[PDB]
Amino acid sequence: LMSWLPPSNQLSPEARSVLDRMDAAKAPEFNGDLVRQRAFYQQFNDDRLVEMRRVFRTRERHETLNAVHVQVVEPADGVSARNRDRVLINVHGGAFMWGAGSGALVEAIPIAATMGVSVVTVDYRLAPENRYPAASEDVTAVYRALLERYPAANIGIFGTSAGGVITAQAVTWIRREGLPRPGAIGTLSGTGAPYSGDSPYLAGVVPVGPGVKAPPLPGLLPTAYMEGVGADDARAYPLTSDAETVFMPPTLLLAGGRDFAVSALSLAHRRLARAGVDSELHLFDGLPHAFFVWPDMPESLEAYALIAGFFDSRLGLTP
Amino acid sequence: LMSWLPPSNQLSPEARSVLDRMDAAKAPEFNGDLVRQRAFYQQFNDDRLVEMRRVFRTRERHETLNAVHVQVVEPADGVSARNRDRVLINVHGGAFMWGAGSGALVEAIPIAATMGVSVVTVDYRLAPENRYPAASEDVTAVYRALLERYPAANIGIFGTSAGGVITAQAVTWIRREGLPRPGAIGTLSGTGAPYSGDSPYLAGVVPVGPGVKAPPLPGLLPTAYMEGVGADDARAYPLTSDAETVFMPPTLLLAGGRDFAVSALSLAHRRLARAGVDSELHLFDGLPHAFFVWPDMPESLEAYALIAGFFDSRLGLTP
Ligand SMILES: [Cl-]
Ligand SMILES: [Mg+2]
Ligand SMILES: [Mg+2]
Ligand SMILES: [Mg+2]
């Protein structure tokens, strides 16, 4: 549907180049060959990591917190004095099935370097080997460990795509455990809700157009990670639950304008505002899902600055 | 493009009914016949006014402030204690050429009655008989009069469509006059910027699709009101100017998801956030430009509540 439009006239020349490379880099069909699929996205994430290391200077260490593998990503210059008593948890994307290692660094590096903060990126259990709520348990275990060193108000959690879904689910799991809620979250290109509204049609997630009979959208996320979880499970789909929505911490919702998640994120932001939760929504016209894993455009740097700015204004400072 | 989609699955049954009423209310072709066009929209605004008076109980008085005709719109039994020291200025839409009288009450009534506040709706000079900056001068004259009774921090300005554009232009005119900036504004379905990005194509403002050559979009607003004003006039187009944007007050940007203005509002929100201005963006998936002139749907009431809540949180309270 969108292929009939010119590129958004808001875009930098650099973004217009990225969009052509994104389309050219599209995966072939894998037909259930998970090993071939994982190898393709391992290469994709390694390619984006090379681009990140050209732009940003960071140091990464492996750690284990409460039996969960993490990578701790810091600016090579060191964390700023302002951020000495803050930390972010990153939850990587990758369709709930890949993104471990380089995909996690691709999300953590630009935010660690831009904000000047420590980012703990979680190597959570993946589908299809593991199922909901495995990733919630993993992120909550990391969060529990960081509460030994950082006040809850000074901890942020963010993730992109599948990671934005898991970030919202981790919040409800933290509450289920009786832990203090995090200071702020980023649910980027995804949250604790099914895809809905117009954007999945416009992005072609569901086929539509001349002579073509558009089906209703599912009220569940189709991923194997979520199979058999009901739409009524407020911990799994909190941005459809008035109760879990009221308990959300301050939330940043960021998407591309051509991102299949954007209709759901605009509704989530309306629900957070009605519930009295501090939330912020940004849309980058013309850009796709999870666009800011491609760092070679001003729009990605701009996104990193909005993420850094949100955490810098919402997280506590004091030890 | 959008006729191939089902209605957004987020919409209430009432909104799906309003969407069909909107289609039935669409103007026939006028061939530049301004008299016929004005008569058509007079009836359209009178029809929406009947619907407003069914839902909301207000009282309206005519006044003149600094030689500008206004209507003062209040809840029928009086303004709330919360809002005794606050006032909103409304700037009606109508393509800069109509909307005087009933069109202005259609924007003022739901916010007066929802927030429980006095709304002064300005009968500003229209195109093509008047040109930029006539409407800025008119709104600034009203603002200057209200500063005799209300602190600048306690005054909000809002408008829809053409009125959102004029609201942003009135802010720059107020600064030109050496007056204190208003406490907050609402630039709804329009701001001080051309329409841009993807949404003008998806809304069908400009033809796109098989066998059609989609043209580039203009860098100026095409209205007679703005004839001969340059793109480089930062007072006319403040949300395209990094200088005028840093001086903006706290801003609410609200649009339908199918609104031709939505791409421009998402960019204006990014620019306000980078300039450190408090701004809030809401998008109502599946709804068109200026949807909330139709009060008979929960989504309109929800929009009125977001407008009231933005002014309630940003305007001062002190006498
Ligand atoms: Cl916002
Ligand atoms: Mg432990
Ligand atoms: Mg808010
Ligand atoms: Mg803000």
UniProtKB/TrEMBL annotation, chains A, B:
The keyword Hydrolase applies. It is an enzyme of class 3 (hydrolase). It comes from the Bacteria. This is PMGL2. Its EC number is 3.1.1.3. Keywords: Hydrolase.
